[PDB]
Amino acid sequence: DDVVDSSKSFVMENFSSYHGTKPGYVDSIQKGIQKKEFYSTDNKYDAAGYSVDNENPLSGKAGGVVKVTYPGLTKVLALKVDNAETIKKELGLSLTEPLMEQVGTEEFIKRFGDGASRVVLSLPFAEGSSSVEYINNWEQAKALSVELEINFETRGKRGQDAMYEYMAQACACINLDWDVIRDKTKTKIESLKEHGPIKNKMSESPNKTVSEEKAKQYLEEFHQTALEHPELSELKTVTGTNPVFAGANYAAWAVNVAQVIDSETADNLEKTTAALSILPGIGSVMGIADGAVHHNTEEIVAQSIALSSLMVAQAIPLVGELVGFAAYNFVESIINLFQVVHNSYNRPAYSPGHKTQPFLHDGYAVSWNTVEDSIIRTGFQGESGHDIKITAENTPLPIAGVLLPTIPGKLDVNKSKTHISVNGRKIRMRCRAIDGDVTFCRPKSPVYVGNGVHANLHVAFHRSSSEKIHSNEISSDSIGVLGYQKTKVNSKLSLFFEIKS
Amino acid sequence: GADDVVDSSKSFVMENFSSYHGTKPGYVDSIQKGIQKKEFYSTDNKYDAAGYSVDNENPLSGKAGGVVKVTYPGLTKVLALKVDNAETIKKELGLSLTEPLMEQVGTEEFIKRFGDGASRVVLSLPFAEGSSSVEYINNWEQAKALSVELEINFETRGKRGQDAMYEYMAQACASCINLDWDVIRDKTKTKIESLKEHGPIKNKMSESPNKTVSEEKAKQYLEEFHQTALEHPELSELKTVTGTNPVFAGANYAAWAVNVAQVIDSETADNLEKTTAALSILPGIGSVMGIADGAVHHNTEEIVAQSIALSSLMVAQAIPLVGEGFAAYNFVESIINLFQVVHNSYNRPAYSPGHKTQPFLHDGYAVSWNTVEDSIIRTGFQGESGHDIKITAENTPLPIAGVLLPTIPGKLDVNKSKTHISVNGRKIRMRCRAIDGDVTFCRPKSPVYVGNGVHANLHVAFHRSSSEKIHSISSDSIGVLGYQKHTKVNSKLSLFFEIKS
Ligand SMILES: NC(=O)c1cccnc1
Ligand SMILES: NC(=O)c1cccnc1
C-alpha cells in the first residue's frame, strides 16, 4: 500500500553511501558501524556538512567523510512520506513496534526485500535538494564495510577550510584558496596599520565612548582614508558603484560588531561566530548583492576583510566594551561566514521569480502559484491557465498591467479568461498586441495590492496550432507584471517560465 | 471519467434556482423582458454581479447599470466542475470534442445524462481565487426560460460617479467601511472653497515661483504649503490623525502632489477615464487615503473630505511648479473613484500576511507557509506532523537566528531530530530547548543566511504523546527570528496557524 515510491526503489549489489563523521570518530568508525537509526547519503559533500564537532557546531573542527558499503544485495525502499505511523499502517506493519527495528527483521526483509539481504529506507534529503537520505537499521548496519573518503584534520588546514574547499568541488563556482586569503589578509592588515595617512586619521579619533552617529561619521572618514592605500586599490574600484559596498555600510558594519562583542565573547571563536552570525549588513563586507558574489577572487576578498578588520579595530574604543579581537577571532570568524554564504551560492537553487521562489522588488512580492503554473506546455491545441500571486508589503501599490509573450497560433492570450482577482474581486482585462511578440493586458478596474490586499493574476493561453514552440522562438523567458510608474517607466516584476513537452 | 472533472459533492438539483446578473447602463430595462443572446453568466453573489455593471467604454470610471435576479422555473441541475478547461471537460465527459461545451450542455442528451430529472443543467465554477462566490454558466437556449427581476438600478439612485455601485457593495459587510460619498463630496468642495480664501494660505501662494522648477524645489515649497495649509480649522481633525504615522506626513503629500502634476497633461485633464488611468498607476496613494499597516485609518466622512480637500489644493499648487482647474474637478472626481476601489478591497474577506499561504513581508525578509495544510496543526491523535515554511530575503544575505515554537504539555511537543532548516538544499539541524512560557526555541547548528538566490525551508516537526484534542494555546503564531537590531531584539517574522479537527 502506497507510502512507497516503486519507481525510485531498487535492488543493488555492493550498495554504497556516505556518512559524515565528527572529529574523534574518523579512524574509529572505519573499524565498523556500531550503535535506529544510522543515516547515510548518496552525496558525499552533503555528508561533509555533518562532520563538525558537536561541541562547537558553528566553528568547530570538521572530522571526515566515510564510504559505507553493504556486501551482497541491498533493497533500497523509497518512501513518499516520513510519517512513521502512516508507514507502519499502510504496510501492515505492527503499529506498536518501532519502524526501523521492524525493517531489520527477516519478516520485513522477506516481504519488501525482493530477494535482498536487507532493506534500507530512502527519503528526499531536503527541500531544494536532489540528494537522497538513507535510513539504515542498526543490526543490519554491522554488515557494512567502512572506507575513508577524506579526513579534514589530516589536511592540516585552519578553521573549516578543508571542509569547505572539499564541498566546493561539487561545482568544479566560487572555488577560493583560503590559505592564500588568510596570508594576504594578514599582510594587508599589517601594511595598513603602518601607513602615515592612516595612523594619522587614527590619532584624529576621539578614542573614547562616543555616540553611534558620531562613531559612524569618523569611521566613514577612516574608511575613505584607508581605501586610498595601494593594497586596497582593487577594492576601491569594485566597491565604487554599488551602494551596498559603500563606506557608510562598512561603518555601520564595524559599529555593529563593536557593539555586540564583549570580552567573554571576544575570547571564544564559537561565541564570536554566534554573535557575528546574527548581524545584518554582512553583504557589504562580503561584496554580495543582487544575487551574485562580486568579491570572487582571493585578492579582493582579502582586501575587504583587511579593511573591515581595521575598521572594527577603530570602532571598538568608540562603541565597544573591549579594552586584538579585530585581528584574531574577528578574522577567523568572518572567514567562516564567508564560506557558509559562498557554499549557499555554489548550491543549485532557483532564482527569484523562477518556480515558486518569490520575486521581491519595489515593495511588491510576486510568485507563480505552483510549479506547474510556471511551465508553459506546448505542442498541442487548446487551453492552459497560469496563476501568479501578487501582494505588496505595506501601503497600496498599483498593478498597471502585464506583458505576455505571444506566438501566432502557438501561444495566444485568451482575452476572456485572462483576469486578475483582488481579494476575490474578479477584474477582467483589456489586452492589446504591441510588438506582436508581446501583448499588454491592462485591468478594467484599478488594481492595488498591499498589507491585507492580495491578487491572483490568472493568465490564460490558447493554442490554435499543435506545433511545438521551439528554442530560439520565444521573445522572452518571463512574464512581465508592471507595477507603479516611476523618462517614465514602470516597476518591473518578472515571473520566469519554462517551455516543456 | 466524469468524476475527474465534476465535483459530485458540490452539485445539486434545486427548485426555483436563482442567481444574479450584472447589467450595463441602457440594458437594465431591456434585460427584464427576457434573456437573449457564447455563454450567459450569473453568480450566486449579488455584490459581485454589481462589479460587472460598469460602462464597457469607460471601465474605470463609467456609469453603473444595475443588477437583476434571474430564476429558472421548475427543477435545475447545478453541475460543479473541478477544472475550467473545455477540452478536458468535453473529453472526460465523453462529449463531442469538436463542438463548443455550452452548446452541448443545453441539449436533451446531455441534460438526460447529467440533469438527474432536472429540466436543464447549469455549470458551476469557483468565481475567483480568494473568493467564496460561485460563477454560473448558462446555455443561451435554456436561458430563455429565465424570469428576470430587478434587484437594483444604480441610475435611479441618480448619484454621482460610481457611488451607487460602491455603496451597494459595502452592504455585504453591514469591520466595514461604509461611507456616505454624497457627504464627502459636499464637505470636500466646501473645504476647498474655505482653504482657498484663507489669509495665511493665499499669502503662501504668492510666495510661489509660479513657474517650471526642479523637483527638489517644488517639493520644498509644497511641504511648506502643506504645513501652512494643515493649520486651517477645517482640516483640524486631519492635523491630529496624520500626526504620528510617517506615511501620512507632508513630505508624502508633496511627493503625491508633484507626481500628479508631472503626469497630467491637457488631454488627460479633460477626460475622467483618462485621468483615472493616469492616477491609478502612481505610487504613494496610501498617503492621501490614510491607509497603512493593513488598516484604513481615514474611515470617517469628515476625515476623508479633509484629506482629499488638502491634496486637491496641493495639486493646484504643484501644476505651475512642475506640470503643464483640473485640481478641483477631475482630480477630485478621479481620486474619489480610487478611494472607493481600495476601500472595497479592504471590506472583502481576505487572509492577512503570514496566514495560509499569504507571505509575511518585513525587514527585507519574505516568509510563508509552503501550503495551506502546513499552516494547520491537526489535533486529536497521538503522533507526528511536519510543517514547511519558505524563507527568503530581497537582496543581501540576511540571517535567520532561530525559531520560537508554541508547545503544550504532552499534547504538542517539538520533535527535535526531525525539525531542521534547509538552505539551498543544505540540511541544517537545529538545537532546540524548551524555555519559559510553553515556547521552544530552536537555533540552527550552522549559520543560516537568505537573500536574492538563497532561500530556506524551515521544517517544523510536532509530536503528540496524547490523543486528547487541543482546546482553546498561548500563541497562534510561530516566530521566525531574523537579524538582531533601547534593547537588543530580533526581527520577528510571524507565521499564523490554525488548530483543527
Ligand atoms: N551523518 C550523516 O552523514 C548524515 C546523513 C544524512 C542525514 N543525517 C546524517
Ligand atoms: N455580468 C455578470 O453578472 C457576470 C457574473 C459572473 C461572471 N461574469 C459576469
Q: Which three cell numbers stand for residue B270?
A: 479633460
Q: What are phi and psi of B355, to 5 degrees?
A: -105, 150
Tell me how far the alpha carbon of residue B302 lies from the centroid of ligand 2, in angstroms: 35
Q: How far is CA B485 from CA A391, B222, B490, B492, in A?
A: 26, 35, 6, 11
Query: Which residues 145-164 on chain A approach chain B with CB closer than 8 angstroms?
Result: none
Q: What is the 3-state secondary structure (H, E, C) of A426-442?
A: EEEEEEEECCCCEEEEE
- Whether A478 and A353 have beta carbons less than 8 Å apart is answered as yes
Distance CA A30, CA A68 (A): 9
DSSP B33: G
Whether chain B has a CB inside 8 Å of the CB on A361: the answer is yes
Mark yes or no for CB contact B341/A452 under 8 Å: no
Instruction: Quickly tell me which residue has 447529467 as its cell.
Output: B114
Residues A360-397 as b/e (b if ≥16 CB within 10 A, e otherwise) read: bbbbbbbbbbeeebbbbbbeeeebbebbbbbbbbbbbb
Q: Which of B342, B427, B431 is the closest to A396 by Cβ?
A: B342
Mutation target to probe the A interface, by most A beta carbons within 10 A, among B38, B91, B129 is B129
Q: Which three cell numbers stand for residue A345?
A: 551560492
Q: Which three cell numbers stand for residue A348?
A: 543549485
Tell me how long chain B is: 501
Distance CA B134, CA B81 (A): 11
Instruction: Quickly tell me which residue has 572555488 as its cell.
Output: A175
Please tell me the number of the ligand nearest to residue B42's CA: 2
Q: Which of B42, B44, B84, B131 to mutate to test the pocket of ligand 2 (most atoms within 8 A of CB)?
A: B42
Residue of A77, A345, A319, A58 lying closest to B424 (CA atoms): A345
Label residue B86 exposed, middle or buried (CB < 10 Å: 0-12, 13-18, 19+).
middle
What is the distance, to the nearest Å, from the Cα of residue A107 to the centroid of all Cα atoms in its chain?
A: 43
Domains of chain B and CATH, by start? 1-175 (3.90.175.10), 176-350 (1.10.490.40), 351-501 (2.60.40.700)
| DSSP three-state, residue B359 | coil
Q: Which atom of ligand 1 is nearest to the CA of A20?
A: 3
List residues in chain A that are followed by a break over 2.5 Å (C to N). 35, 172, 323, 486
Please identify which of the residues B15, B135, B155, B468 carries the catalytic annotation.
B135
**Min Cα separation B344/chain A (Å):** 9
Number of CB pairs, chain A paired with chain B, less than 8 A apart: 285
Task: Give residues with Cβ within 8 angstroms of B332, minimum separation 6.
Answer: B188, B189, B192, B308, B312
Please tell me the number of the ligand nearest to residue A45's CA: 1
Task: Give residues with Cβ within 8 angstroms of A389, minimum separation 6.
Answer: A365, A366, A367, A368, A369, A454, A455, A456, B357
The stretches of A151-296 forming alpha helices (DSSP H) are 161-167, 178-194, 196-203, 212-226, 233-238, 247-260, 263-266, 269-276, 282-286
Residues with CB under 6 A from ligand 1: A 19-20, 39-41, 47, 50, 133
DSSP A239: T
Distance CA B121, CA B105 (A): 7
**Min Cα separation A404/chain B (Å):** 19
Distance CA A143, CA A38 (A): 13
Label residue A478 exposed, middle or buried (CB < 10 Å: 0-12, 13-18, 19+).
middle
- Whether A364 and A390 have beta carbons less than 8 Å apart is answered as yes
Query: Which residues 293-322 on chain A approach chain B with CB closer than 8 angstroms?
Result: none
Distance CA B227, CA A390 (A): 36
**Chain A residues touching B399 at Cβ < 8 A:** 277-280, 282
Residue of A453, A498, A389 lying closest to B286 (CA atoms): A453
Whether chain A has a CB inside 8 Å of the CB on B87: the answer is yes
Q: How far is CA A445 from CA A64, B48, B126, in A?
A: 62, 13, 20
- Whether A235 and A300 have beta carbons less than 8 Å apart is answered as yes
Label residue B160 exposed, middle or buried (CB < 10 Å: 0-12, 13-18, 19+).
exposed
Q: Which residues pair with B359 in a beta bridge?
A: none
Question: How many CB atoms sit inside 10 A of residue A475's CB?
Answer: 11
Q: What are phi and psi of B277, to 5 degrees?
A: -60, -50
Q: Which three cell numbers stand for residue A265?
A: 565573547
Whether chain B has a CB inside 8 Å of the CB on A417: the answer is yes
**Chain A residues touching B337 at Cβ < 8 A:** 446
Tell me how far the alpha carbon of residue A334 lies from the centroid of ligand 2, in angstroms: 60
Q: What are phi and psi of B495, to 5 degrees?
A: -115, 120
- DSSP strand pairing (A16-21 vs A118-124): unpaired
Question: How many CB atoms sit inside 10 A of residue B103's CB?
Answer: 16
- Whether B364 and A352 have beta carbons less than 8 Å apart is answered as no
Distance CA A214, CA B52 (A): 60
Distance CA B453, CA A350 (A): 7
Distance CA B481, CA A282 (A): 17
What is the DSSP annotation of B246-299?
GGGSHHHHHHHHHHHHHH--HHHHT-HHHHHHHHHT-S-HHHHHTEETTEE---
Distance CA A344, CA A168 (A): 10
- Whether B57 and B80 have beta carbons less than 8 Å apart is answered as no
Tell me how far the alpha carbon of residue A351 lies from the centroid of ligand 1, in angstroms: 27
What is the H or E stretch that residue A471 is in? none
- Whether A392 and A363 have beta carbons less than 8 Å apart is answered as yes
- Whether B497 and B375 have beta carbons less than 8 Å apart is answered as yes
Distance CA B280, CA A397 (A): 9
What is the DSSP annotation of B468-493?
SPPP----SEEEEEEEE-----EEEE
Query: Which residues 117-146 on chain A approach chain B with CB closer than 8 angstroms?
Result: 125-131
Distance CA A475, CA A367 (A): 21
Q: What are phi and psi of A19, to 5 degrees?
A: -145, 115
Q: Which three cell numbers stand for residue A270?
A: 564559537
The yes-or-no answer on residue B92 being catalytic is: no
- Whether B417 and B465 have beta carbons less than 8 Å apart is answered as no
Q: Which three cell numbers stand for residue A61?
A: 573542527
Question: How many CB atoms sit inside 10 A of residue A89's CB?
Answer: 13
Whether chain B has a CB inside 8 Å of the CB on A349: the answer is yes
Distance CA B109, CA B118 (A): 12
Mark yes or no for CB contact A445/B60 under 8 Å: yes
Give, to the nearest 10 degrees, the angle between helix A329-346 and helix A269-276. Answer: 60
Mark yes or no for CB contact B457/A127 under 8 Å: yes
Residue A372, amino acid: E
Distance CA A291, CA A286 (A): 12
Mutation target to probe the B interface, by most B beta carbons within 10 A, among A269, A360, A431 is A360
Tell me how long chain A is: 501
Q: Is B52 annotated as a binding residue?
A: yes
Q: What is the resolution of this structure in A?
A: 2.1
Mark the binding-site residues of A for NAD(+), compressed into ranges. Answer: 19, 50
Distance CA A26, CA B336 (A): 73
Q: How far is CA A397 from CA A365, A443, B394, B452, in A?
A: 11, 14, 18, 22
- Whether A100 and A50 have beta carbons less than 8 Å apart is answered as no
- Whether A124 and A42 have beta carbons less than 8 Å apart is answered as no
| DSSP three-state, residue A74 | strand
- Whether B83 and B170 have beta carbons less than 8 Å apart is answered as no
Distance CA A217, CA A236 (A): 19
Apex A245 CA angle, A243 and A250, nearest 5: 115
DSSP B451: B
DSSP B231: T
Q: Which atom of ligand 1 is nearest to the CA of A134?
A: 6
Q: Please, which experimental method was used?
A: X-ray
Whether chain A has a CB inside 8 Å of the CB on B474: the answer is no
What is the distance, to the nearest Å, from the Cα of residue B204 to the centroid of all Cα atoms in its chain?
A: 40
Q: Which three cell numbers stand for residue B351?
A: 487572509
Residue A189, amino acid: I
Q: Which of B344, B361, B392 is the closest to A357 by Cβ?
A: B392
DSSP A428: E
- Whether A140 and A45 have beta carbons less than 8 Å apart is answered as no
DSSP B86: H
Instruction: Quickly tell me which residue has 430563455 as its cell.
Output: B144
| DSSP three-state, residue A258 | helix
- Whether A253 and A284 have beta carbons less than 8 Å apart is answered as yes
| DSSP three-state, residue A108 | helix
Q: Which residues pair with B495 in a beta bridge?
A: B478
Tell me how far the alpha carbon of residue B100 lies from the centroid of ligand 2, in angstroms: 19
Q: Which three cell numbers stand for residue A357?
A: 521562489
**Min Cα separation A236/chain B (Å):** 20
**Strand order, beta sheet including B75-80:** B12-15, B75-80, B120-126, B134-138, B40-43, B18-23, B66-71, B147-153
Q: Which residues pair with A398 in a beta bridge?
A: A448
